[PDB]
Amino acid sequence: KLRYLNILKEKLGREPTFVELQAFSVMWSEHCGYSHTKKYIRRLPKTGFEGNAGVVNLDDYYSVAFKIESHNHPSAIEPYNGAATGVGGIIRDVLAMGARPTAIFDSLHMSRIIDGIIEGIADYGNSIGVPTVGGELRISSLYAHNPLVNVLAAGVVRNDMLVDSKASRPGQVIVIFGGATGRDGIIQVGDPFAEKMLIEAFLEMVEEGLVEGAQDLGAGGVLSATSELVAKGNLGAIVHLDRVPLREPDMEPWEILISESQERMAVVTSPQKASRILEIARKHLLFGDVVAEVIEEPVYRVMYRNDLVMEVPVQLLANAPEEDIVEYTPGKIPEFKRVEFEEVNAREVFEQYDGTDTVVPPGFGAAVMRIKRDGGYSLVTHSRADLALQDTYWGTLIAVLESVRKTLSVGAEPLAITNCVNYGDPDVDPVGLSAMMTALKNACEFSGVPVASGNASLYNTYQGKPIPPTLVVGMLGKVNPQKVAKPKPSKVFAVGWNDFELEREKELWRAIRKLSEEGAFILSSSQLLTRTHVETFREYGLKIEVKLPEVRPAHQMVLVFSERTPVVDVPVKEIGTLSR
Ligand SMILES: Nc1ncnc2c1ncn2[C@@H]1O[C@H](COP(=O)(O)OP(=O)(O)OP(=O)(O)O)[C@@H](O)[C@H]1O
Ligand SMILES: Nc1ncnc2c1ncn2[C@@H]1O[C@H](COP(=O)(O)OP(=O)(O)OP(=O)(O)O)[C@@H](O)[C@H]1O
Ligand SMILES: [Mg+2]
Ligand SMILES: [Mg+2]
């Protein structure tokens, strides 16, 4: 942080107080700051319905709010709480956009099935009543010292009730409510039962027109939520640390400001509404009070009673120093060799804990959620660190295209992407981060699917060795649930090629679309057929007998289940049956 210390020191025109130095150690961390990634993120093609990042319009009446986050470090120190708390964090993020949380995805990258990570995800989600609908279970010793835990949350919001994530005008106030504040993160055992009440309370305040802007409390606590709300609106704030409901009544002002206590929300509102907010909160049995005032002048003044605690420009907190970037010029696509990840069955794994509410049960790729009898969305998470380990550019890019395939195979049309950038050290290796970010930019360009939201985790490393570069893609699609194909007794075909050439990818797509439209069932898996598919087929009472083609690590083939032979402008070979 030294280069950034002298910058802050230059900007404040003195050494900083103690309070400042803590404010800044949180807001300019790489986690809150994105110093190495914000230029590359500006380069991504984006979407955000009518302004709102992370919200993608589905059908002119509803939108899906969706985002993926990582909780890697927390999960390595304490698997169960780490993972349970990252669910509670991501759920809260989607809540703040006004969306009722409908689905969880956990993408996991472990040297073994770490039970505590599995159950922390399961227990928390079960207790807030938000089901887990899919995710990834990627096993290899390569992640032995750095488990990756990326949780994706989604939910539905009406377009006429989207909550803005910023202040708009002086005179507004900021309410904080939810659990009380204690000395957390200066792992807390999040509670699901508090969070459920937070959900209901927030949605009820939304329904009455009370929320004009909102932002969940995460990293940085009151500090981030409140600086960010006004900073986005180009406004300032006076924040009154004494109004924050305490769980430890004898905390110092800096600890109130920076605490990372769970289940807390910020709500921007009119002062006339705040007392209704406060009343829904307490009804739920939440804590809450009016904590800050939105002021015109871009300062961020923090009071405790009438004692000044800190005052700095709002924009100086909000904008961490941006690192240079490296331009990356992709080369030729390599001959990949197999990096082995262990066969697992995510079916069996999750069954010490808690069939889902999707159109077709989990286990076959992409999950479809029903909004209306004839309206839905799909969701899937994918990554290819096996390929990315040998070629970061190409292996990343292929995860994105294989995401489109999974989305198409279920009948759905891709709408957007949320992505989680999991990486080693970008000071030491700046080019591999660039290959990763440029692979995500180009694959969005090539496929036409824009990025709605994302997250980054850098400095994932063990004794100077980095993890495999691991970008997990969560893609969202639009599909009518009445047109979703169910497994039935049928013939099985390999459709497509055993290897990969970029310029045929679009012809694979066009072929998956034709077949899905005639009502075929399709699997787009990277080793074509998994244990999870074979076991989920048994649930329907169906046995699959096939001779799987030999395929390259990167390929362009899918399996098509059909009573007739596919008729497409791509290679088609019949390889077995499923039945009985
Ligand atoms: N951690 C998990 N939690 C919940 N569901 C999971 C999890 N991991 C995998 N699943 C589900 O199990 C099914 C099998 O997933 P898996 O990744 O093994 O196969 P795939 O995604 O079809 O193929 P591939 O990843 O090899 O391209 C998918 O529907 C997946 O979403
Ligand atoms: N890899 C990425 N790809 C695209 N957009 C990203 C990526 N990483 C961050 N962003 C965007 O950068 C902005 C910074 O948000 P940030 O990730 O700091 O936290 P948040 O989503 O606001 O809240 P939380 O702390 O719960 O994640 C967000 O709008 C986010 O969606
Ligand atoms: Mg947020
Ligand atoms: Mg998968």
XYZ file of C-alpha atoms and ligand atoms in Angstrom:
644
model
C 0.000 0.000 0.000
C 3.044 2.382 0.122
C 2.704 3.814 -3.368
C -1.003 4.490 -2.450
C -0.074 5.881 0.993
C 2.077 8.610 -0.575
C -0.718 9.420 -3.001
C -3.290 9.736 -0.256
C -0.705 11.779 1.721
C -0.220 14.020 -1.326
C -4.022 14.365 -1.682
C -4.707 15.228 2.010
C -1.714 17.543 2.206
C -0.636 16.083 5.560
C -0.194 12.585 6.991
C -3.633 11.157 7.644
C -5.245 10.692 11.000
C -5.758 7.257 12.333
C -9.492 7.219 11.344
C -8.561 8.191 7.748
C -5.878 5.568 7.514
C -8.407 2.884 8.408
C -11.030 4.418 6.053
C -8.462 4.304 3.261
C -7.011 0.882 4.091
C -10.495 -0.494 3.374
C -11.649 1.615 0.449
C -8.343 1.438 -1.526
C -7.778 -2.275 -0.919
C -7.823 -4.224 -4.114
C -11.103 -5.738 -2.903
C -12.969 -2.434 -2.589
C -10.756 -0.550 -5.007
C -10.286 -2.655 -8.208
C -7.089 -0.698 -8.873
C -5.663 -3.407 -11.183
C -8.984 -4.169 -12.881
C -11.162 -1.055 -13.384
C -9.590 -0.014 -16.723
C -10.110 -3.507 -18.167
C -13.671 -3.488 -16.811
C -14.396 -0.223 -18.597
C -13.487 -2.062 -21.765
C -16.191 -4.747 -21.396
C -19.436 -4.459 -23.336
C -22.092 -3.800 -20.653
C -25.842 -3.770 -19.976
C -27.942 -2.467 -17.134
C -31.626 -1.953 -17.858
C -32.477 1.775 -17.968
C -29.275 2.532 -16.088
C -29.235 -0.288 -13.512
C -26.153 -2.549 -13.514
C -26.896 -6.155 -12.741
C -30.474 -5.883 -13.930
C -31.359 -7.418 -17.187
C -34.782 -6.878 -18.723
C -36.397 -10.161 -19.540
C -39.707 -9.241 -21.043
C -40.629 -5.627 -20.578
C -42.429 -6.292 -17.390
C -39.848 -8.157 -15.334
C -36.109 -8.054 -15.068
C -33.589 -10.457 -13.518
C -31.158 -9.026 -11.003
C -28.039 -11.261 -10.809
C -24.483 -11.163 -9.662
C -21.648 -13.534 -8.674
C -19.117 -12.833 -5.878
C -16.145 -14.665 -4.433
C -15.419 -15.584 -0.854
C -12.179 -17.419 -1.249
C -9.875 -16.411 1.589
C -12.708 -16.426 4.214
C -13.544 -19.929 3.060
C -9.982 -21.209 3.373
C -9.668 -19.885 6.971
C -13.168 -21.153 7.963
C -14.942 -23.331 5.385
C -18.468 -23.434 6.912
C -18.884 -19.816 8.037
C -16.792 -18.486 5.176
C -19.085 -20.091 2.632
C -22.338 -19.434 4.574
C -21.431 -15.791 4.990
C -20.595 -15.437 1.329
C -24.081 -16.674 0.542
C -25.572 -14.101 2.898
C -23.421 -11.354 1.286
C -24.356 -12.113 -2.311
C -28.063 -12.528 -1.458
C -28.046 -9.086 0.141
C -26.410 -7.589 -2.966
C -29.282 -8.750 -5.163
C -31.845 -7.744 -2.596
C -30.551 -4.109 -2.781
C -31.543 -3.955 -6.422
C -35.097 -4.647 -5.260
C -35.150 -8.204 -6.542
C -36.661 -11.034 -4.525
C -33.857 -13.620 -4.305
C -34.904 -16.775 -6.161
C -31.770 -18.957 -6.770
C -28.257 -19.674 -5.595
C -25.291 -21.090 -7.619
C -22.017 -21.998 -5.947
C -19.047 -22.551 -8.272
C -16.441 -24.484 -6.171
C -12.770 -25.230 -6.931
C -11.211 -27.492 -4.307
C -8.530 -30.154 -3.954
C -11.283 -32.299 -2.292
C -14.995 -32.096 -1.472
C -14.692 -29.848 1.593
C -17.861 -30.869 3.419
C -17.944 -27.720 5.625
C -18.028 -25.574 2.448
C -20.898 -27.611 0.991
C -23.006 -27.541 4.141
C -22.338 -23.893 4.946
C -23.804 -23.113 1.471
C -26.691 -25.638 1.943
C -27.609 -24.786 5.489
C -27.708 -20.992 4.978
C -29.669 -21.246 1.749
C -32.110 -23.733 3.254
C -32.659 -21.373 6.225
C -33.326 -18.251 4.183
C -35.615 -20.254 1.826
C -33.603 -19.597 -1.336
C -32.825 -22.828 -3.117
C -29.472 -23.806 -4.615
C -30.053 -24.629 -8.202
C -26.616 -25.488 -9.714
C -22.993 -24.464 -9.557
C -19.682 -26.199 -10.292
C -17.582 -28.699 -8.413
C -14.152 -28.531 -9.937
C -11.632 -30.774 -8.127
C -7.861 -30.730 -8.539
C -4.815 -30.472 -6.202
C -4.060 -27.216 -7.939
C -6.483 -25.548 -5.591
C -5.147 -27.294 -2.449
C -3.951 -24.083 -0.796
C -6.534 -21.766 -2.380
C -10.112 -23.071 -2.452
C -12.263 -20.922 -4.735
C -15.826 -20.194 -3.560
C -17.825 -18.120 -6.014
C -21.516 -17.649 -5.217
C -24.020 -16.340 -7.659
C -27.453 -15.087 -6.632
C -30.435 -14.228 -8.766
C -33.886 -12.883 -8.357
C -36.886 -11.279 -10.055
C -37.874 -7.607 -9.884
C -40.665 -5.718 -11.655
C -39.341 -3.051 -13.973
C -41.549 -0.444 -12.264
C -39.962 -1.182 -8.899
C -36.199 -1.157 -9.614
C -34.272 0.385 -6.726
C -31.600 2.832 -7.616
C -28.203 2.349 -6.008
C -27.416 5.991 -5.325
C -28.421 9.245 -3.655
C -30.160 11.802 -5.994
C -30.782 15.091 -4.164
C -29.727 16.943 -1.031
C -32.012 16.473 1.954
C -32.398 12.769 1.457
C -31.405 10.717 4.496
C -29.781 7.263 4.845
C -31.291 4.719 7.107
C -29.242 1.700 8.231
C -31.148 -1.327 9.484
C -30.827 -5.048 9.983
C -28.696 -6.744 12.601
C -26.814 -4.613 15.090
C -23.150 -3.575 14.685
C -20.390 -5.290 16.772
C -16.676 -5.515 16.241
C -16.870 -7.855 13.219
C -13.962 -7.933 10.699
C -11.832 -5.318 12.367
C -15.397 -14.655 10.339
C -18.784 -13.593 11.733
C -21.383 -16.376 11.928
C -23.986 -14.825 9.633
C -27.526 -15.720 10.520
C -29.975 -16.876 7.880
C -32.965 -16.147 10.194
C -32.003 -12.483 10.531
C -31.338 -12.276 6.827
C -34.805 -13.760 6.014
C -36.344 -10.974 8.134
C -34.173 -8.478 6.278
C -35.445 -9.752 2.984
C -39.121 -9.469 4.001
C -38.596 -6.071 5.624
C -36.730 -4.651 2.650
C -39.214 -5.949 0.159
C -42.140 -4.503 2.178
C -40.438 -1.111 2.264
C -39.967 -1.441 -1.507
C -43.625 -2.258 -2.097
C -44.778 0.893 -0.242
C -42.581 3.206 -2.367
C -40.241 3.972 0.527
C -36.854 3.038 -0.941
C -35.297 5.652 -3.248
C -31.839 3.976 -3.352
C -30.176 1.197 -1.328
C -26.874 -0.577 -0.956
C -26.061 -3.563 1.223
C -23.417 -3.489 3.982
C -20.398 -5.636 3.095
C -16.753 -4.830 3.114
C -16.114 -1.511 4.782
C -19.486 -1.400 6.532
C -21.232 1.950 7.053
C -18.262 3.535 5.410
C -18.633 2.016 1.919
C -22.366 1.799 1.799
C -22.685 5.579 2.623
C -19.686 6.931 0.688
C -20.707 4.911 -2.341
C -24.376 5.998 -2.301
C -23.501 9.725 -2.358
C -20.361 9.346 -4.496
C -22.445 7.742 -7.248
C -24.907 10.656 -7.090
C -22.083 13.250 -7.016
C -23.405 14.371 -3.605
C -21.867 14.374 -0.078
C -23.005 13.090 3.347
C -22.785 13.927 6.993
C -22.827 10.664 8.878
C -23.820 10.396 12.531
C -22.008 7.439 14.042
C -23.983 7.700 17.287
C -27.257 6.718 15.585
C -25.892 3.360 14.424
C -27.513 0.605 16.480
C -24.683 -1.147 18.461
C -24.372 -4.757 19.614
C -21.343 -3.585 21.620
C -22.358 -0.181 23.039
C -18.789 0.771 23.986
C -17.232 0.819 20.511
C -15.009 3.634 19.278
C -16.107 5.779 16.339
C -13.690 4.219 13.867
C -14.993 0.741 14.774
C -18.591 1.727 14.214
C -17.664 3.042 10.809
C -15.713 0.088 9.552
C -17.420 -2.817 11.213
C -18.400 -5.581 8.829
C -21.393 -6.865 10.844
C -23.788 -9.055 8.880
C -27.333 -8.530 7.657
C -27.308 -4.784 7.387
C -28.799 -2.657 4.645
C -28.565 1.051 3.689
C -31.750 2.750 2.384
C -31.697 6.237 0.753
C -35.061 7.990 1.275
C -37.092 11.133 1.953
C -37.001 12.075 5.674
C -40.824 11.891 5.708
C -40.644 8.118 4.867
C -37.821 7.140 7.218
C -40.165 6.589 10.119
C -42.250 4.106 8.171
C -38.962 2.342 7.218
C -38.049 2.271 10.910
C -41.429 0.832 11.806
C -41.268 -1.970 9.235
C -37.797 -2.783 10.506
C -38.757 -3.088 14.164
C -41.893 -4.971 13.245
C -39.441 -7.534 11.845
C -37.499 -7.498 14.851
C -34.608 -5.598 13.211
C -32.611 -2.579 14.405
C -32.552 0.650 12.453
C -32.243 4.398 12.695
C -31.576 7.363 10.441
C -27.773 7.546 10.213
C -26.707 10.021 7.513
C -27.774 13.106 5.654
C -27.276 13.650 1.954
C -25.688 17.115 1.476
C -24.960 19.057 -1.728
C -21.295 19.697 -1.166
C -19.150 16.695 -2.093
C -17.726 16.168 1.348
C -18.002 13.135 3.545
C -18.056 14.411 7.136
C -18.298 11.805 9.839
C -19.665 12.851 13.274
C -19.857 11.146 16.645
C -22.254 13.345 18.652
C -20.896 16.839 17.760
C -17.258 15.777 17.666
C -15.831 15.721 14.117
C -14.427 12.297 13.323
C -13.241 12.677 9.730
C -13.970 14.858 6.733
C -12.519 14.188 3.313
C -13.698 14.629 -0.240
C -16.267 11.918 -1.085
C -14.646 11.359 -4.453
C -11.226 10.743 -2.932
C -12.687 7.802 -0.980
C -14.633 6.429 -3.984
C -11.795 6.393 -6.493
C -8.774 4.228 -5.683
C -5.613 4.885 -7.715
C -5.773 3.068 -11.046
C -2.894 0.826 -12.166
C -1.747 0.891 -15.811
C -2.908 -2.009 -18.026
C -1.009 -4.265 -20.450
C -2.459 -4.805 -23.949
C -2.570 -8.422 -24.891
C -2.531 -9.588 -28.463
C -3.947 -13.027 -28.723
C -1.855 -15.600 -30.570
C -2.854 -18.889 -32.099
C -4.996 -21.425 -30.288
C -2.823 -24.299 -28.901
C -3.129 -28.075 -28.970
C -4.521 -28.515 -25.469
C -3.453 -31.480 -23.350
C -5.588 -32.958 -20.628
C -5.245 -31.525 -17.149
C -7.273 -33.956 -14.999
C -10.033 -32.824 -12.637
C -11.760 -35.571 -10.682
C -15.169 -37.015 -11.548
C -17.636 -36.015 -8.880
C -21.400 -36.286 -8.695
C -22.950 -33.018 -7.454
C -26.197 -34.974 -7.170
C -24.878 -37.196 -4.380
C -22.729 -34.510 -2.782
C -25.600 -32.210 -1.772
C -27.807 -35.026 -0.477
C -26.602 -35.165 3.132
C -28.415 -31.782 3.340
C -31.471 -31.159 0.981
C -35.829 -32.032 -5.824
C -35.699 -28.369 -6.759
C -38.158 -25.861 -8.196
C -36.672 -25.666 -11.694
C -38.576 -26.665 -14.841
C -36.248 -29.673 -15.333
C -34.464 -30.913 -12.095
C -30.795 -29.995 -11.556
C -28.092 -32.268 -12.820
C -28.176 -31.639 -16.552
C -26.342 -28.412 -17.172
C -28.358 -25.175 -17.245
C -31.268 -24.643 -14.799
C -34.521 -23.011 -15.929
C -36.698 -20.952 -13.591
C -40.385 -20.295 -14.172
C -41.760 -16.807 -13.824
C -45.180 -17.357 -15.543
C -46.617 -20.359 -17.326
C -44.871 -19.148 -20.555
C -42.050 -16.933 -19.241
C -38.728 -17.998 -17.717
C -34.955 -17.545 -17.522
C -32.042 -19.902 -17.504
C -28.866 -19.735 -15.498
C -25.572 -21.656 -15.677
C -22.021 -21.272 -14.298
C -18.960 -22.478 -16.105
C -15.195 -22.197 -16.167
C -12.265 -24.043 -17.882
C -9.204 -23.534 -15.673
C -7.883 -26.855 -17.151
C -7.503 -25.075 -20.478
C -6.743 -21.692 -18.937
C -3.755 -23.127 -17.071
C -2.082 -23.918 -20.406
C -3.465 -20.933 -22.306
C -5.065 -18.170 -20.342
C -6.478 -16.226 -23.328
C -7.985 -19.202 -25.171
C -9.135 -21.168 -22.121
C -11.030 -18.179 -20.823
C -12.558 -17.378 -24.175
C -13.727 -20.997 -24.557
C -15.497 -20.997 -21.104
C -17.587 -18.046 -22.417
C -18.502 -19.863 -25.684
C -19.254 -23.091 -23.875
C -21.537 -20.992 -21.687
C -23.531 -19.913 -24.763
C -23.753 -23.580 -25.770
C -25.231 -24.615 -22.362
C -27.717 -21.770 -22.618
C -28.730 -22.699 -26.199
C -28.992 -26.405 -25.337
C -31.817 -25.627 -22.965
C -33.772 -23.599 -25.535
C -32.804 -20.328 -23.944
C -31.471 -17.168 -25.744
C -28.392 -15.670 -24.074
C -29.098 -12.298 -22.424
C -26.023 -11.382 -20.335
C -23.106 -12.541 -18.278
C -21.888 -12.051 -14.741
C -18.334 -13.131 -14.248
C -15.919 -13.731 -11.416
C -12.196 -13.086 -12.143
C -10.143 -15.298 -9.851
C -6.414 -14.680 -10.348
C -2.863 -14.872 -8.841
C -0.586 -11.789 -8.459
C -0.930 -9.091 -11.165
C 2.166 -7.086 -10.059
C 4.309 -10.184 -10.707
C 2.206 -11.416 -13.645
C 0.355 -8.492 -15.275
C -0.042 -10.133 -18.699
C -2.114 -13.208 -17.652
C -4.702 -10.892 -16.019
C -4.814 -9.012 -19.326
C -5.219 -12.200 -21.365
C -8.095 -13.099 -19.044
C -9.792 -9.718 -19.253
C -9.251 -9.417 -22.997
C -10.557 -12.957 -23.487
C -13.775 -11.935 -21.710
C -14.056 -8.735 -23.837
C -13.551 -10.547 -27.115
C -15.812 -13.511 -26.343
C -18.624 -11.005 -25.452
C -17.998 -9.258 -28.795
C -17.898 -12.520 -30.695
C -21.002 -13.975 -29.133
C -22.842 -10.692 -28.650
C -23.531 -11.288 -24.959
C -22.794 -8.224 -22.835
C -21.550 -8.217 -19.219
C -24.077 -7.001 -16.580
C -21.942 -7.226 -13.415
C -19.012 -9.142 -12.045
C -16.408 -9.284 -9.355
C -12.628 -9.833 -8.999
C -10.395 -11.780 -6.612
C -6.626 -11.244 -7.147
C -3.540 -12.291 -5.185
C -4.723 -15.926 -5.012
C -1.361 -17.529 -4.508
C 0.535 -19.989 -2.405
C 4.244 -19.459 -1.659
C 4.563 -17.338 -4.758
C 2.765 -19.912 -6.902
C -0.505 -18.626 -8.489
C -3.777 -20.591 -8.829
C -4.909 -21.596 -12.355
C -6.435 -18.509 -13.829
C -10.101 -19.106 -13.049
C -12.839 -16.948 -14.532
C -16.298 -18.352 -13.693
C -19.044 -17.266 -16.051
C -22.640 -17.129 -14.962
C -24.752 -16.658 -18.034
C -28.410 -15.690 -18.198
C -30.937 -16.619 -20.834
C -34.607 -16.100 -21.752
C -36.650 -19.208 -22.338
C -40.368 -20.089 -22.386
C -40.771 -22.959 -19.777
C -43.430 -24.661 -21.931
C -40.831 -25.302 -24.600
C -38.298 -26.971 -22.296
C -37.473 -30.551 -23.241
C -37.637 -33.236 -20.604
C -35.585 -36.364 -20.688
C -37.527 -39.277 -22.287
C -36.644 -42.693 -23.797
C -34.786 -41.997 -27.046
C -31.698 -42.330 -29.275
C -28.381 -40.550 -28.435
C -26.230 -38.747 -31.092
C -22.833 -36.964 -31.000
C -23.394 -33.740 -32.867
C -20.506 -31.489 -33.918
C -16.746 -32.007 -34.131
C -14.184 -33.681 -31.750
C -11.913 -30.628 -31.788
C -12.251 -26.889 -31.806
C -12.051 -24.244 -34.517
C -13.266 -20.792 -33.662
C -14.820 -20.183 -37.062
C -17.249 -23.156 -36.716
C -18.550 -22.167 -33.279
C -21.496 -20.229 -34.746
C -22.509 -23.221 -36.862
C -22.626 -25.395 -33.666
C -24.869 -22.779 -32.134
C -27.182 -22.626 -35.119
C -27.476 -26.434 -34.999
C -28.167 -26.543 -31.254
C -30.926 -23.961 -31.847
C -32.587 -25.955 -34.689
C -32.628 -29.186 -32.622
C -33.852 -27.609 -29.396
C -36.651 -25.921 -31.294
C -37.813 -29.353 -32.536
C -37.917 -30.452 -28.888
C -34.747 -32.462 -28.501
C -33.000 -32.810 -25.138
C -29.346 -31.696 -25.316
C -26.240 -31.970 -23.088
C -23.328 -29.575 -23.654
C -20.685 -30.834 -21.235
C -16.889 -30.545 -21.542
C -16.289 -34.355 -21.378
C -19.695 -34.779 -23.011
C -21.236 -36.973 -20.345
C -20.746 -36.746 -16.553
C -21.563 -38.870 -13.537
C -24.023 -36.233 -12.461
C -25.947 -36.712 -15.775
C -25.884 -40.482 -15.627
C -27.267 -40.404 -12.060
C -29.944 -37.759 -12.714
C -31.056 -39.920 -15.714
C -31.632 -42.785 -13.171
C -34.034 -40.537 -11.269
C -36.259 -40.556 -14.315
C -35.771 -44.285 -14.345
C -33.629 -44.141 -17.568
C -30.400 -45.931 -18.348
C -28.032 -44.455 -20.880
C -25.930 -46.891 -22.983
C -23.547 -45.131 -25.350
C -20.090 -45.303 -26.960
C -18.691 -41.868 -26.158
C -16.467 -40.541 -28.940
C -12.845 -39.711 -28.162
C -12.778 -35.879 -28.035
C -10.038 -33.184 -27.592
C -9.848 -31.085 -24.369
C -11.408 -28.159 -26.275
C -14.130 -29.625 -28.550
C -17.372 -28.667 -30.369
C -19.671 -31.599 -29.772
C -22.841 -32.021 -27.729
C -25.142 -35.025 -27.092
C -28.623 -34.902 -28.602
C -31.406 -37.064 -27.322
C -34.072 -37.709 -29.879
C -36.504 -40.255 -31.184
C -35.295 -39.402 -34.746
C -31.845 -38.783 -36.309
C -30.838 -35.115 -36.232
C -30.920 -33.236 -39.510
C -28.361 -30.447 -39.287
C -25.526 -28.927 -41.354
C -23.040 -30.413 -38.902
C -21.538 -33.900 -38.365
C -23.966 -36.302 -36.679
C -23.219 -39.804 -35.368
C -25.516 -42.140 -33.352
C -23.829 -43.640 -30.373
C -26.409 -45.338 -28.195
C -29.711 -45.249 -26.430
C -31.574 -44.294 -23.274
C -34.600 -46.100 -21.998
C -36.926 -48.085 -19.842
N -21.507 -27.076 -6.284
C -22.706 -27.400 -6.869
N -23.918 -27.068 -6.395
C -25.077 -27.319 -6.995
N -25.170 -27.918 -8.181
C -24.039 -28.328 -8.794
C -22.739 -28.024 -8.184
N -21.776 -28.441 -9.024
C -22.433 -28.966 -10.091
N -23.769 -28.950 -9.948
C -24.729 -29.342 -11.000
O -24.503 -30.683 -11.444
C -24.669 -30.788 -12.860
C -23.347 -31.367 -13.369
O -22.345 -30.369 -13.365
P -20.883 -30.657 -13.925
O -20.074 -29.406 -13.936
O -20.281 -31.915 -13.385
O -21.364 -30.985 -15.437
P -21.586 -29.934 -16.648
O -21.598 -28.557 -16.038
O -22.688 -30.515 -17.465
O -20.253 -30.182 -17.544
P -18.785 -29.460 -17.619
O -18.561 -28.643 -16.398
O -17.888 -30.683 -17.499
O -18.645 -28.698 -18.931
C -24.941 -29.390 -13.388
O -26.341 -29.157 -13.617
C -24.436 -28.501 -12.243
O -24.991 -27.179 -12.327
N -14.878 -9.012 -13.365
C -15.814 -8.028 -13.467
N -16.507 -7.923 -14.602
C -17.410 -6.963 -14.734
N -17.777 -6.051 -13.836
C -17.176 -6.035 -12.637
C -16.169 -7.079 -12.391
N -15.765 -6.800 -11.140
C -16.423 -5.747 -10.609
N -17.281 -5.291 -11.525
C -18.216 -4.170 -11.305
O -17.491 -3.197 -10.538
C -18.376 -2.513 -9.670
C -17.765 -2.546 -8.277
O -18.635 -3.294 -7.421
P -18.001 -4.258 -6.294
O -17.661 -5.570 -6.963
O -16.941 -3.408 -5.627
O -19.072 -4.652 -5.141
P -20.688 -4.649 -5.207
O -21.149 -5.641 -6.254
O -21.154 -3.215 -5.398
O -21.138 -5.123 -3.724
P -20.536 -6.430 -3.004
O -19.461 -5.892 -2.074
O -21.673 -7.162 -2.314
O -19.976 -7.168 -4.189
C -19.666 -3.338 -9.668
O -20.718 -2.715 -10.423
C -19.310 -4.645 -10.352
O -20.471 -5.284 -10.921
Mg -24.142 -3.648 -3.641
Mg -20.039 -27.502 -14.994
